[PDB]
Amino acid sequence: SSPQPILDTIYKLLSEQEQTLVQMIHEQSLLLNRLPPTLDENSLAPLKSLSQKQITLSGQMNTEMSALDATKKGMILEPTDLAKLFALKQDLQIQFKQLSLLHNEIQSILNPQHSAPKPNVALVLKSQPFPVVISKGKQLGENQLVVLVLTGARSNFHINGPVKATMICDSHPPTTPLEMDSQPIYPATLTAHFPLKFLAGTRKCSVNLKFGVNIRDLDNVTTTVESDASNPFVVITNECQWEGSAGVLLKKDAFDGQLEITWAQFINTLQRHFLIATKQDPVRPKRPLSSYDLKYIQTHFFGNRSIIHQQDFDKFWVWFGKSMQTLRYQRHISTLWQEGIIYGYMGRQEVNDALQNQDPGTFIIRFSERNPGQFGIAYIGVEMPARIKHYLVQPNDTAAAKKTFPDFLSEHSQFVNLLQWTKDTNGAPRFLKLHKDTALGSFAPKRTAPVPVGGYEPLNS
Amino acid sequence: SSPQPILDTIYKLLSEQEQTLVQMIHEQSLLLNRLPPTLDENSLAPLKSLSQKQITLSGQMNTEMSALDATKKGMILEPTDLAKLFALKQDLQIQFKQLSLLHNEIQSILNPQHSAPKPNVALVLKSQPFPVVISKGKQLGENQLVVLVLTGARSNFHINGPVKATMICDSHPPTTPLEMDSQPIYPATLTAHFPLKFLAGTRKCSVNLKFGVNIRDLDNVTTTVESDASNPFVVITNECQWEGSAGVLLKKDAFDGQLEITWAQFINTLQRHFLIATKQDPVRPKRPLSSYDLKYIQTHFFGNRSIIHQQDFDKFWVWFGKSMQTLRYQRHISTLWQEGIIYGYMGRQEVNDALQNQDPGTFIIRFSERNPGQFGIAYIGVEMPARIKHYLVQPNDTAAAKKTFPDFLSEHSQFVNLLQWTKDTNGAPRFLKLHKDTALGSFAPKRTAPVPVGGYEPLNS
């Protein structure tokens, strides 16, 4: 954590390199129309000097990529730094492709016969909402999926037809999954916005989008140019699949055709997916998996190694995937957990040691380790001597509309003063004894008529 | 209270006077067979000297009666002193009648022509179980109802037939209420034991027994001699009437044809009846109405006066009678109240002031003032700020066999540590915070298999 250096360094590079390519795209096409009918030396001295600058710059661009690729693989990045590495990675990739087309162009001059290069165009995803688990039928925003066309200084070609989107699944083993696959291109920017409509589930299989357009050479040769695959994603048809899809998506994004990945590589991906599940802000998340939650995960499901394997995942998701389906779908859980109301990821010994001798009625809510997707309230009992008593909250305790976990909680005098997970002044998270009613404040049943004074009342309510 | 003097003084008198009558009964009949055929002075000088002793002693006996009658009427007597005044009263009455028959006899000699005297016999109740509320069909013990025949030194008569028991009701406005009404007389003691069998209810009306026997004069004149009425009592036929009967019995014993009685006279009677209701020992009762309970009664139902009226009673019994039906009939209540577990007679302000700032879960059980025969648990709540919350225990909270008040109590985490009414070392009653489970110790559900350790358990049980 705190890779604040590596990244802010690379960000300044990209902002500069961004401007270098502007003056370079101009400098090139300029020095390109000014090349005589033909002549070698005197005429091609300035082009060779450019090629030099390009190759040099290409190299810096390669060092950068490795630097980033190594950070994601070797450092646990905090939410902000994480979202940034991803952003820098995407932009540097584009810069690299841009520079590449300019160079291939200047090269098709200095050293022709080298052949190939094909039409010097390129389709890249300037922005995408993937990865993510999409619910069948939702439609993307007008600026969520934008495709950018990259060219050389001089365009020795024309574009025929619109840019098309094609869904692909490479675990290959009979209709239209998308709506609005064809989009024209904006001139001032050469971009194409795809407000795709997802018309079909994927059957819990990762998927990627591919864009392509037909380019007609200046010699009337038609070539189809395509983009690399987008980030993976899955389309589900019922909130019942969110898990299987989400796990598959996570497993795919995490390992990517590999059997073993670093610990950092793994959690950096999960953190990313965890925030997407809980629909939290990527940069300033209300509550991201903390270092504590990571260690818990690293200990209870991974042997505490700094290298994770393919099959250790299958077991981790059996449990974890459930804890998340609960966070994303069970009413108020997400909100209550993001607040500190529900601690969540904690093991026995830890829940107990955190309660060692507290007034009776003190409790902490966390995830059952044997009952995936379920909570286990650990409270101190009334009976003497007072001992720590755990309670598995079961499905029937909650009911779809009426009793939601927060209702259930304020109905048992056995749950008095909560141990909330609050943030301190040095920002450090802490445990401060609120009162079941104070903490649940925002969820409590709003008393209409004021409190009765004088006779007798019912016991609990 | 503490009339320890008055009574222990009179007790020594009765024990002595008891022996004086022994030597007097002997001295008399002796000096009676030794009286010549007839002669006045010289012969009747010793008889006149006896008559003097008798009259003197009769007088001491009268001072004693008034002394006792005034104590019951002007001093609140504690259980022991109370049972004693009643015992002394009964024995002194008998001594008085005995002495009377001896004197009438010596007088029928010295001053005949004075006429009357009738056969010089007397039937007195040497012992009785009244007052009390009897359940139809029960049968008395062989020594619970004994009748004693008193005579003069010389018996100038014979007894024909057995001693009979006759039930009487003087609120007069078609069969056999008793079994075994006729009993013979034991010679060595001239007593008749009546193990009466109550064959009929009384319809909530006080009743008294009357004993009588036929005596045949030495001149063949037959006279029926009777005893004064026994203490009142009532026979009920169902536990539903215990109240109406008990109140009527209490009202009758308390006032006795009067409209106004002293405060002391009143409570001394209630104390007596209260111990009989709760089936407690008269001398060493586990828990008798305390001075506190008396003041409560004196304040909430009597205007705090030292003189009680007939109609103030009708209202008092409306409530109190119920609190007692609960003590005598509702399961474990009697035991729980006799223990200090249930305090009982306490008013609002008092219940609250006794709880002013106690840990949440602290409670005292007492009688509802608006809900006669019902309990109102006053406990401190969980909610903050913690305030005193009263709860009316209703009939459905309890069920005949399964849930008895003590079960109900140990089922709500809202009732934690009880404020028990315990006795201190100087014997003074006190409030010591036991634990709902410690105090209910003897009633708790006996856990078969030992306490589970390791997983999750249900919330309350």
Domains and CATH numbers, chain B: 1-110 (1.20.58.240), 112-239 (2.60.40.340), 241-328 (1.10.238.10), 329-461 (3.30.505.10)
What are A141's two structure tokens?
């925003």
- DSSP character at residue A186: B
Resolution of this PDB entry, in A? 2.7
Number of separate helices (H) and strands (E) present in chain A: 11, 18
Hey, are the CB atoms on A391 and B456 less than 8 Å from each other?
A: yes
Between A and B, how many residue pairs show a Cβ–Cβ distance under 8 A?
57
* Cβ pair A146, A125 in contact under 8 A: yes
All residues of chain B having their beta carbon less than 8 Å from the beta carbon of residue A455 are 370, 390, 392
Nearest CA in chain B to A378: B456
d(CA B250, CA A349): 65
Q: Which of the 8 DSSP states describes residue A436? A: H
Rounded CA-CA distance A459/B92 in Å is 57
Spell out which residues of chain A touch residue B382, defining contact as CB-CB under 8 Å. 361, 413, 416, 436
Q: Quick one: which of B164, B167, B230 has its CA closest to B202?
A: B167
Q: Answer whether A391 sits within 8 Å of B459, measured CB to CB.
A: yes
Which of B422, B399, B342, B403 is closest to B376 using CA atoms? B342
Both tokens assigned to B441: 């110790």
Nearest residue of A to residue B349, measured between CA atoms: A454
CA distance A431 to chain B (A): 19
Flag if B437 and A383 touch (Cβ within 8 Å).
yes
Q: In A, what residues contact B, Cβ < 8 A? A: 360-361, 368, 370, 376, 382-384, 389-392, 412-414, 416, 435-438, 455-460
Of the residues A377, A417, A456, A457, the best mutation for testing chain B's interface (the one with the most B CB atoms within 10 Å of its CB) is A456
Q: How far apart are CA A250 and CA A233, in angstroms?
A: 9
Helix, strand, coil share of chain A (percent; to 5): 40, 20, 40
Tokens of A247: 């796990």
Q: Which amino acid is at B22?
A: V
Half-sphere exposure of A241 (CA within 13 A, CB side): 18
Give dist(CA A126, CA A148) in Å, integer.
Answer: 6
Tally of CB atoms within 10 A around B386: 15
Q: How far is A196 from chain B (nearest CA, A)?
A: 48
DSSP collapsed to 3 states, chain B: CCCHHHHHHHHHHHHHHHHHHHHHHHHHHHHHHCCCCCCCHHHHHHHHHHHHHHHHHHHHHHHHHHHHHHHHHHCCCCHHHHHHHHHHHHHHHHHHHHHHHHHHHHHHHHCCCCCCCCCCCEEEEEECCCCCEEECCCECCCCCCEEEEECCCCCCEEEEEEEEEEEECCCCCCCCCEECCEECCECCCCEEECCCEECCCCCCCCEEEEEEEEEEECCCCEEEEECCCCCCEEEECCCCCHHHHHHHHHHHHHHCCCCEEEHHHHHHHHHHHHHHHCCCCCCCCCCCCCHHHHHHHHHHCCCCCCEEEHHHHHHHHHHHHHHHHHHHHCCCHHHHHHHCCCCECCCHHHHHHCCCCCCCCCEEEEECCCCCCCEEEEEECCCCCCCEEEEECCHHHCECCCECHHHHHCCCCCCCCEEEEEECCCCCEEEEECCHHHHCHHHCCCCCCCCCCCCCCCCCC
- Degrees, nearest 5: CA angle B324-B330-B335: 80
- The span from the CA of A433 to the CA of A417, in Å, is 6
> Are residues B359 and B417 in contact, defined by beta-carbon separation less than 8 angstroms?
yes
Determine the Cα–Cα distance for residues B132 and B139; give it in Å rounded to an integer. 13
Going by C-alpha positions, the residue among B228, B177, B233 that lies closest to residue B205 is B233
Q: How far B392 CA sits from the closest chain A CA (Å)? A: 6
Per the document, the length of chain A is 461
End-to-end, the C-alpha distance of chain B in Å comes to: 48
Contact call for A435 and B361, based on CB within 8 A: no
| DSSP-derived pairing of the beta strands A234-236 and A133-135 | parallel
CA distance A320 to A316: 6
- After which residues do gaps appear in chain B, with C to N over 2.5 Å? 173
Q: Which of B151, B123, B119, B149 is nearest to B218 (CA)?
A: B119
Find the helix or strand (DSSP H, E) in which A421 lies.
Answer: strand A419-423
Shortest Cα distance, chain B CAs vs residue A440, angstroms:
12
Report the gap between the CA of A405 and the closest CA in chain B (Å).
Answer: 15
Q: Which residues of A touch B376 (CB under 8 A)?
A: 456
Method: X-ray
Report the distance separating Cα A212 and Cα A205, nearest Å.
23
Cα–Cα distance, B288 to B274 (Å, whole number): 8
Amino acid at A454: G
Sign of CA dihedral A267, A271, A273, A277: positive
Check: CB of residue B102 under 8 Å from CB of residue B158: no
User: Would you say A141 and A134 are in contact if contact means Cβ atoms under 8 Å apart?
Assistant: no
Residues with Cβ within 8 Å of residue A396, at least 6 apart in sequence:
none
The bridge status of strand A222-226 relative to strand A234-236 is unpaired
Whether omega for the bond prior to residue A372 falls within 30 degrees of 0, making it cis, is: no
Q: What is the C-alpha separation between B274 and A291, in angstroms, rounded?
A: 70
Residue A449's SS3 state is coil
Q: What angle do CA B35, B40, B44 make, to 5 degrees?
A: 55
Q: Which residues of A touch B412 (CB under 8 A)?
A: 413, 459
CB contact under 8 A, B457 and A368: no
User: CA-to-CA distance for A349 and B110, rounded, in angstroms?
Assistant: 105
Pairwise CA distance, residues A266 & A73, whole Å: 8
Which residue from A306, A274, A299 is spatially nearest to A287, judged by alpha carbons? A274
Long-range contacts for A82-87 (Cβ within 8 Å, ≥24 apart)?
A82/A268, A82/A271, A82/A272, A82/A282, A83/A282, A83/A283, A84/A7, A84/A11, A84/A283, A85/A3, A85/A7, A86/A272
Distances (CA, A) of A109 to A45, A119, B71, B113: 12, 14, 136, 173
Query: Which H or E run contains A37?
Result: none
Question: What are φ and ψ of residue A343, in 5° steps?
Answer: -70, -55
Q: Distance of CA B68 to CAs B90, B96, B135, B400, B427, Å?
A: 11, 14, 32, 45, 28
Question: Cβ–Cβ of A456/B390 closer than 8 Å?
Answer: yes
Q: In this structure, what token pair is assigned to residue A252? A: 């795919």
**How would you classify residue A235: left for phi > 0, otherwise alpha for psi between -120 and 50, otherwise beta?**
beta
Contact B51, B106 (CB under 8 A): yes
Kindly list the residues from chain A whose CB atom is less than 8 angstroms away from the CB atom of residue B410: none
Distance to chain A for B416, nearest Cα, Å: 6
Q: Quick one: residue B137, left, alpha or beta (phi over 0 = left, psi -120 to 50 = alpha)?
A: left
- Residue A42 corresponds to which tokens in the numbers above? 């005197």
C-alpha distances out from residue A191 to A86, A149, A163, A183, B238, Å: 21, 6, 10, 9, 97
Taking contacts as CB-CB distances below 8 angstroms, the residues of chain B near A361 are 360, 382
Angle at B193 between CA B192 and CA B195, to 5 degrees: 145
Distances, alpha carbon A47 to alpha carbons A28, A315, B143, B217, in Å? 8, 58, 138, 165
Yes or no: say if A196 and A139 are a contact pair by the CB < 8 Å rule.
yes
First vs last Cα of chain A: how many Å apart? 48
Structure tokens at B230: 């026994």
Task: Measure the CA dihedral A90/A96/A98/A99, to 10°.
Answer: 160
